[PDB]
């Protein structure tokens, strides 16, 4: 691919998603969602191999039945009022199939299924992407009809995908795919507070984009897409290896790092609308990752893992391409946990 | 009441829907597809919709020869699948069809709804306007006002055919 | 839908032990048709007849459950003239969790949902009487 | 999982099998030991034809200078353990 | 020493050491000046000074 | 004496396709060490045509 | 779910309205703005470390940078945060002298006439 | 609702459950998601139509223009995944698991 | 109802032609006769085989060109708006960057057939 080629076309799926978040009609929601689709399918399959083929594939098949049901959505909602700004859903079953295509859009559970797979499928730069940029056009829309969700079904999906996240992240030995999981589980987080406060989603997406950032950069950095390569990086680099623990801690929720922040406000949020029985279960669910992300840090970090003879001329290099934000992005990622009330800002 | 053309043309399109959706081979499948793009222009014009429905059945030919070719080119078979060589297709085939009749019989014999709402049919023909002036169409209008006040939808249009020019360049390089 | 659980909730709690029964019956055939819908679609059984009798043991056990609980639950609460009481609740589960363990014919099994599904159902009659709600409006 | 651990008794069973299903060999005066030629009286094309039909049965390929060596459905046992590595 | 072209000689770029001086110091007098202002329109407004 | 570090039949537990090993999954293989799998021998058959002798 | 985003006479996308301006401004020893300098000199220390350099000492400049960019950004998050404090008190003040049927005021009794019931620790 | 708009909504449920049950073919899901796109052209122009809102008449075009990319876009994959298989069968691409 | 009872008349007089060549003649249908032509032999291979398609970029850049004919066609009647200048500037700028378009792949060679 042409870096020209490139350039234009990660332009094309941020003006994509700009689109869908400037856009009062929904009928220019639904063109930033259809061009967002379009060049981003290309950025997928850069590096060509049948892995990557499959996961464009995937990927596309999913948003495009998705885009499919929103703008039905959108024709029934006309239907029942000749309305086409974009405020508040005036049919319930166009309510129901706008939440079930933003759900797809998303990954949440049960429509997860796609996102380990073509996670695992591309390139860690193409992983990154999706990971963080393909959140916020689906979720700006969720922010701005809220009032209109139905909270049964959000909290159904939300709590599905918290547990479905945890126990499939418990099985994975590929990084990407434990990647996956965790965005899938923090995605139910982000989505099981947004009927309450939207200004807690917007945060916990903050958070997790930053911290999602940092562990991605982190693994371009050490090249790294397994345990047991990552098993070899506190041969070469420990500082990254350290950095790395540290960064799994904070995506762990402990505190007092930043990863402890939005699940905190989300809980006491809860609180605020006599929910108590959901955000103990959300909380002993995310148990799960943090025990992952712990053996994770066992088998990269903690303890020194065999090496290979081969190593030893690594020593003698040194990375020529640097990322800029991974040192800024890392102590987001930890310490910001006092700076809290600044979330009055986002709303 | 008034000779229910529109409701057979409907039922036609939905018939046209099952043949493709209970998917035998991609030729018959496209045949079918045409058929549903031929008899929906034949409704939006029964509405007023000559433009709409005459552009839709040209899109959708041409959509279907480019669909033929590349059947015969990477979606064929020794012997493809009609609506009767398979017990899958024809069962799918038959349940469409009797899901439609289902759903017919509790439209007209009674009120009930099905999913969305209710209602009783009785033809389209009810709920026309009855506006009785112009020396123009205000669906050409309509349509032709996209050049004055839908610059931002001409613009958005044009890059995203660009971009799917770029894109499918991009994506069948291969190597 | 909610309408099967309001049709359980209707009947009074220590009155008609055979209609919470049925309907303790009915909510458990539904959850099971549910988890055997999910389990042919994403682990296919490799032929029509062996989906089918998937579904019916799916079915039919979920069927048991619910019934051994909601008549276990009522006769209790009947019995001992203590309608309001997460004890019944609590006993209609073990005997729902012992019905499992003699299904799948494991003893640890039989043990464990008795334990799990007895504290299960003391919780849900406690949220029922103090009003705890699982999935709260948006009150602030 | 994959076909179950493949053992001796059932590759001597679908040997048998196969070897009963020709036509020229009387499926009772048939034995494990019994010689092809000699005691079953057949040709070398009809011991080609035999090494075809347990190709078919047990899915590889068998080269010429072995074939010709397997005289008996005990040999062609003791062969298709040894390319298979069973040991019992 | 090195062998090759060591793209940090000995002396470094005094180019972008300048700049980066330059930004840190324009911003720090950009602050100062701003909270001057923001201190004077607080006090004006409520009556303070 | 010194501290315990893992080994290779240590490393080995997080080396297969997946954690947690079953009957299904113990024929699973991990993928490649680039993301490359080797092309397959799916020969495409050209079309042959009797041009002539009518 | 949106509490204060509709909220009448808003300007879209200004991060600090005009009325700001009556706000004190945060002093420039705000022990939050430290902090945002301790971050901003963290992750000066960070990418001294991850492209193997001396930790402490290697850029003198780029650690400058670093800290005053953070502090300058801190210094607008921190009025952006007080102002809409400051409005969030102000909306609940004025909504409940508009409302005083739904704040009423109570007589409060003394201790010696509240009846108080005694849990004896035995 | 008039018959028409039950008719034209059945059809739309029937091209997704088309789609959402997979044969064989790629390409016979391809051609339910252009049936999907069918439907919503009818549907919308029906509706617009209708109710003379008469700026809305340009949307249904613009909705054909990307369906057209979409088409495009899938066209596009199957030819990779033929190449890679000689084959256009969904049960081909498992390289990839949960 | 003019355009259906002239539709209807075609395609019977078309059936009732097709019928009579089908019911007047005498038939004699052998399997020799009814077997495929090529030209003096049996086929090698079945004619349902895949057949490559060396102009596949194409086909496919024809379905992005087709919708700028659905773009283009009310061009007669946006011609009578007022503001003329801003039409102008609108269909000006869509066949510009069709013809970017086709300029972008005739130079990538992806008007070139696949060898
Ligand atoms: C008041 C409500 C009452 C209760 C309802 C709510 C509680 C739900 C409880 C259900 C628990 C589900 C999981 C349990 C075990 C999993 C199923 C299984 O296969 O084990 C077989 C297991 C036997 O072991 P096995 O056969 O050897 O296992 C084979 C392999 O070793 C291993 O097995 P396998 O490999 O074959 O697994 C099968 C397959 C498939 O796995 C499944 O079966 C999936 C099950 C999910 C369905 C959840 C049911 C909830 C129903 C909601 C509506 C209820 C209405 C009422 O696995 C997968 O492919 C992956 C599964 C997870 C991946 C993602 C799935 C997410 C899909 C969506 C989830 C739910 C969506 C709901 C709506 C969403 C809309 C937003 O047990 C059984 O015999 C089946 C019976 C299960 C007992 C059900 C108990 C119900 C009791 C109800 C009594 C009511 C009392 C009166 C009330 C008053
Ligand atoms: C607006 C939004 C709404 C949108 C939705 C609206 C949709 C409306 C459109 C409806 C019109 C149809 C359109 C045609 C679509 C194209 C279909 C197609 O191409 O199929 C390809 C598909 C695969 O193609 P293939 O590769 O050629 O087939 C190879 C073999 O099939 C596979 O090889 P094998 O034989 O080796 O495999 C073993 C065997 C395995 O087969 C089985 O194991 C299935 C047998 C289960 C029997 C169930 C127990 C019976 C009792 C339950 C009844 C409940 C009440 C009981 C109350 C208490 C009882 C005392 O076959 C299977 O694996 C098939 C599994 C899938 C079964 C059907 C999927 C349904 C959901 C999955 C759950 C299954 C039922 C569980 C119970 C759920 C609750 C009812 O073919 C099929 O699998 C089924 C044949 C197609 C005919 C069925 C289509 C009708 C269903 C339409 C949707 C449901 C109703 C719609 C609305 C109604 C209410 C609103
Ligand atoms: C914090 C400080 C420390 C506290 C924590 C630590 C201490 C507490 C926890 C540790 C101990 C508790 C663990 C529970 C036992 C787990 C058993 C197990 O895992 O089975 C798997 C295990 C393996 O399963 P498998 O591989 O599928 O089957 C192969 C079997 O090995 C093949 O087995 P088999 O063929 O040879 O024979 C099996 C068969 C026949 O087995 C036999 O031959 C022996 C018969 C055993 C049945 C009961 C014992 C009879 C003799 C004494 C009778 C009671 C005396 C007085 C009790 C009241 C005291 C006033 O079993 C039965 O038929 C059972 C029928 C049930 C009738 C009685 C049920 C009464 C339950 C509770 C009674 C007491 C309530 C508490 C009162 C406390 C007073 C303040 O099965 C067994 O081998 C054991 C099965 C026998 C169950 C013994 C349970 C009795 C102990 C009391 C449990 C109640 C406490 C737990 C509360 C929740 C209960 C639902
Ligand atoms: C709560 C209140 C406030 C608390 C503050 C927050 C906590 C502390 C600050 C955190 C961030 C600051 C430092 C982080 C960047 C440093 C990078 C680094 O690697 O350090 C090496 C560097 C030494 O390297 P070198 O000099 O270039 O030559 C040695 C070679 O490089 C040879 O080195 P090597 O790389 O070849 O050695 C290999 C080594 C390399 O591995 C490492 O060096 C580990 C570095 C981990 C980075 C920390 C994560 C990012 C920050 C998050 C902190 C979380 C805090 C929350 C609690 C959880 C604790 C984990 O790898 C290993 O040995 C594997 C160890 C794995 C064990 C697991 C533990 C690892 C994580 C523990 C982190 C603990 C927190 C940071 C504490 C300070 C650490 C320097 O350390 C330093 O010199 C920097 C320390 C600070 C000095 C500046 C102080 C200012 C000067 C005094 C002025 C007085 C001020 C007041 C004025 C009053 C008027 C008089
Ligand atoms: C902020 C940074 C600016 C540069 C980057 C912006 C990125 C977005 C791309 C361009 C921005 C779009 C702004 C144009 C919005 C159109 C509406 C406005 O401009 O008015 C039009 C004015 O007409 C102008 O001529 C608009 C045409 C300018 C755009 C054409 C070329 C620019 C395209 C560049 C990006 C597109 C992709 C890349 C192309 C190479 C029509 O108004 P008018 O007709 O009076 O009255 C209509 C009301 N009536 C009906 C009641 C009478
Ligand atoms: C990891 C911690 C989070 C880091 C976040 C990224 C920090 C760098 C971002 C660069 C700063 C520029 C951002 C915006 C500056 C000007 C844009 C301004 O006009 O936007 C305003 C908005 O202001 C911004 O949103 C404020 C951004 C501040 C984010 C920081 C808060 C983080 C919470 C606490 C963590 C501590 C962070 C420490 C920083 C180093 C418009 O408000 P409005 O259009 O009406 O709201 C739209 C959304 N609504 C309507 C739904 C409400
Ligand atoms: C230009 C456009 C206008 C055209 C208008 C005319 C349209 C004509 C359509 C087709 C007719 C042309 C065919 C020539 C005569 C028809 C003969 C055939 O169709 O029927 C025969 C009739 O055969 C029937 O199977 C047996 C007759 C019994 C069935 C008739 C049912 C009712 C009759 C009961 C008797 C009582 C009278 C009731 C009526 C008043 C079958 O003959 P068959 O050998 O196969 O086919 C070869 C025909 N050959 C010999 C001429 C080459
Ligand atoms: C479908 C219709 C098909 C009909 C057409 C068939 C056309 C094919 C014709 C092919 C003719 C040939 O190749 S001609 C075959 C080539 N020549 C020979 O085979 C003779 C020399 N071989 C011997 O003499 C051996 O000793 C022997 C007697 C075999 C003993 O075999 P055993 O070691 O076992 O004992």
């Given at each position: 691919m042409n870096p020209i080629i490139y350039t234009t076309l990660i332009m094309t799926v941020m003006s994509g998603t700009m689109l869908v978040m400037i856009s009062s009609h929904w009928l220019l929601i639904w063109i930033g969602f259809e061009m967002n689709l379009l060049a981003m399918i290309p950025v997928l399959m850069k590096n060509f191999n049948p892995r990557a083929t499959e996961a464009a594939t995937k990927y596309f098949l999913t948003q495009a039945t998705a885009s499919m049901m929103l703008m039905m959505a959108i024709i029934i909602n006309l239907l029942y009022s000749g309305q086409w700004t974009i405020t508040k859903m005036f049919n319930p079953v166009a309510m129901t199939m706008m939440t079930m295509a933003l759900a797809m859009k998303l990954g949440?559970?049960?429509?997860?299924?796609?996102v380990p797979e073509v996670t695992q499928g591309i390139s860690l730069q193409a992983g990154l992407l999706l990971l963080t940029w393909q959140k916020l056009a689906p979720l700006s829309v969720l922010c701005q009809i809220s009032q209109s969700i139905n909270p049964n079904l959000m909290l159904t999906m939300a709590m599905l995908s918290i547990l479905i996240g945890g126990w499939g992240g418990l099985?994975?030995?590929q990084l990407r795919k434990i990647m996956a999981y965790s965005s899938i589980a923090h995605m139910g987080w982000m989505t099981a507070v947004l009927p309450y406060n939207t200004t807690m989603t917007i945060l916990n997406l903050l958070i997790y984009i930053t911290m999602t950032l940092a562990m991605f950069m982190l693994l371009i950095h050490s090249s790294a897409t397994t345990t047991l390569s990552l098993s070899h990086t506190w041969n070469k680099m420990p500082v990254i290896t350290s950095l790395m623990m540290v960064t799994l801690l904070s995506m762990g929720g402990?505190?007092?790092?930043?990863?402890?922040m939005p699940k905190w406000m989300i809980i006491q949020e809860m609180t605020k609308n006599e929910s108590i029985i959901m955000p103990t279960l959300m909380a002993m669910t995310a148990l799960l990752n943090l025990y992952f992300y712990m053996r994770l840090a066992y088998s990269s970090s903690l303890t020194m893992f065999p090496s290979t003879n081969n190593m030893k001329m690594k020593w003698q290099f040194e990375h020529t391409k640097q990322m800029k934000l991974l040192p800024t992005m890392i102590v987001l990622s930890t310490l910001v946990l006092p700076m809290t009330p600044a979330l009055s800002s986002l709303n | 009441m008034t000779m229910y053309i529109a409701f057979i043309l409907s039922t036609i399109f939905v018939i046209g829907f099952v043949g493709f959706s209970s998917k035998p081979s991609p030729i018959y499948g496209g045949l079918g597809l045409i058929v549903s793009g031929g008899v929906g222009c034949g409704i939006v014009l029964n509405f007023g919709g000559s433009f709409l429905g005459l552009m839709v059945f040209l899109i959708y030919l041409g959509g279907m020869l480019v669909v033929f070719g590349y059947t015969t080119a990477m979606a064929t078979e020794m012997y493809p699948e009609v609506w009767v060589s398979n017990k899958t297709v024809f069962g799918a085939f038959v349940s469409g069809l009797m899901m439609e009749f289902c759903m017919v019989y509790y439209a007209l014999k009674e009120e009930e709804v099905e999913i969305i709402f209710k209602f009783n049919g009785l033809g389209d023909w009810v709920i026309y306007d009855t506006g009785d002036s112009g020396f123009f169409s205000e669906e050409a209008m309509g349509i032709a006002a996209l050049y004055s006040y839908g610059t931002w939808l001409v613009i958005v249009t044009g890059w995203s055919l660009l971009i799917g020019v770029v894109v499918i360049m991009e994506i069948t390089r291969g190597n | 839908a909610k309408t099967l659980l309001h049709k359980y909730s209707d009947i009074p709690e220590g009155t008609e032990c055979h209609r919470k029964a049925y309907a303790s019956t009915s909510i458990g055939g539904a959850t099971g048709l549910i988890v055997s819908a999910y389990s042919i679609a994403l682990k296919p059984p490799a032929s029509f007849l062996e989906g089918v009798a998937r579904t019916g043991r799916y079915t039919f056990t979920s069927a048991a459950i619910g019934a051994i609980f909601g008549l276990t639950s009522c006769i209790s609460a009947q019995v001992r003239e203590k309608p309001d009481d997460p004890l019944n609740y609590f006993i209609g589960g073990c005997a729902g969790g012992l019905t499992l363990g003699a299904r799948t014919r494991s003893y640890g099994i039989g043990a464990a949902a008795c334990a799990y599904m007895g504290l299960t159902a003391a919780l849900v009659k406690m949220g029922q009487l103090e009003g705890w709600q699982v999935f709260a409006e948006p009150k602030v | 999982s994959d076909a179950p651990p493949l053992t001796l008794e059932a590759i001597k069973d679908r040997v048998l099998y196969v070897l009963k299903l020709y036509?020229?060999?009387?499926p009772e005066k048939?034995?494990?030991?019994?010689?092809?030629?000699?005691?079953?009286?057949?040709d070398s094309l009809d011991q080609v034809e035999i090494i075809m039909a347990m190709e078919d049965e047990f899915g590889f390929e068998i080269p010429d200078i072995d074939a010709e060596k397997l005289m008996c459905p005990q040999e062609i046992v003791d062969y298709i353990a040894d390319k298979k590595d069973v040991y019992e | 020493k090195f062998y090759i072209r060591e793209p940090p000689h000995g002396s470094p770029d005094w180019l972008k050491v300048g700049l980066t001086l330059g930004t840190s110091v324009f911003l720090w007098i950009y602050l100062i000046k701003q909270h001057k202002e923001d201190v004077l329109e607080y006090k004006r407004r409520n009556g303070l000074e | 004496a010194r501290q315990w570090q893992p080994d290779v039949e240590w490393a080995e537990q997080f080396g297969g396709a997946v954690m947690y090993p079953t009957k299904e999954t113990a024929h699973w293989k991990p993928p490649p060490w680039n993301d490359v799998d080797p092309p397959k021998d799916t020969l495409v058959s050209n079309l042959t045509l009797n041009f002539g002798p009518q | 779910m949106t509490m204060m985003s509709g909220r009448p006479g808003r300007v879209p996308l200004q991060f600090l309205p005009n009325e700001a301006r009556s706000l004190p401004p945060p002093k420039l020893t705000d022990p939050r703005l430290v902090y945002m300098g301790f971050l901003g000199y963290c992750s000066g220390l960070i990418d001294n470390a991850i492209r193997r350099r001396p930790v402490v000492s290697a850029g003198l400049h780029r650690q400058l940078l670093y800290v005053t960019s953070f502090v300058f950004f801190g210094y607008y998050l921190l009025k952006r945060q007080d102002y809409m404090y400051a409005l969030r008190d102000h909306d609940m003040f004025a909504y409940v002298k508009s409302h005083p049927e739904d704040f009423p005021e109570k007589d409060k009794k003394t201790y010696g006439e509240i009846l108080e019931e005694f849990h004896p620790v035995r | 609702m008039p018959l028409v708009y039950m008719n034209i909504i059945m059809a739309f449920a029937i091209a997704l459950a088309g789609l959402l049950m997979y044969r064989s073919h790629l390409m016979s899901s391809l051609l339910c998601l252009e049936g999907m796109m069918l439907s919503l052209f009818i549907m919308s122009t029906l509706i617009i139509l209708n109710t003379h809102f008469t700026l809305a008449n340009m949307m249904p075009i613009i909705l054909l223009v990307f369906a057209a990319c979409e088409a495009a876009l899938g066209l596009s994959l199957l030819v990779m995944v033929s190449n890679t298989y000689g084959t256009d069968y969904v049960q081909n691409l498992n390289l990839l698991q949960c | 109802m003019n355009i259906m009872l002239t539709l209807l008349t075609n395609v019977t007089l078309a059936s009732l032609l097709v019928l009579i060549a089908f019911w007047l003649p005498q038939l004699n249908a052998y399997s020799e006769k009814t077997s495929p032509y090529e030209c003096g032999f049996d086929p090698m291979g079945s004619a349902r085989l895949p057949f490559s398609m060396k102009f596949f970029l194409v086909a496919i850049t024809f379905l992005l060109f087709d919708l700028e004919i659905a773009l283009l066609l009310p061009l007669p009647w946006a011609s009578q708006t007022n503001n003329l200048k801003t039409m102008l500037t609108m269909a000006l700028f869509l066949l510009i960057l069709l013809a970017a378009s086709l300029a972008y792949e005739w130079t990538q060679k992806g008007l070139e057939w696949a060898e």
């Open positions: 949440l559970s049960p429509f997860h299924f796609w099985n994975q030995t402990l505190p007092p790092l930043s990863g402890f | - | - | 036509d020229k060999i009387d048939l034995s494990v030991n019994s010689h092809f030629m000699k005691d079953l009286g057949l | - | - | - | - | -």
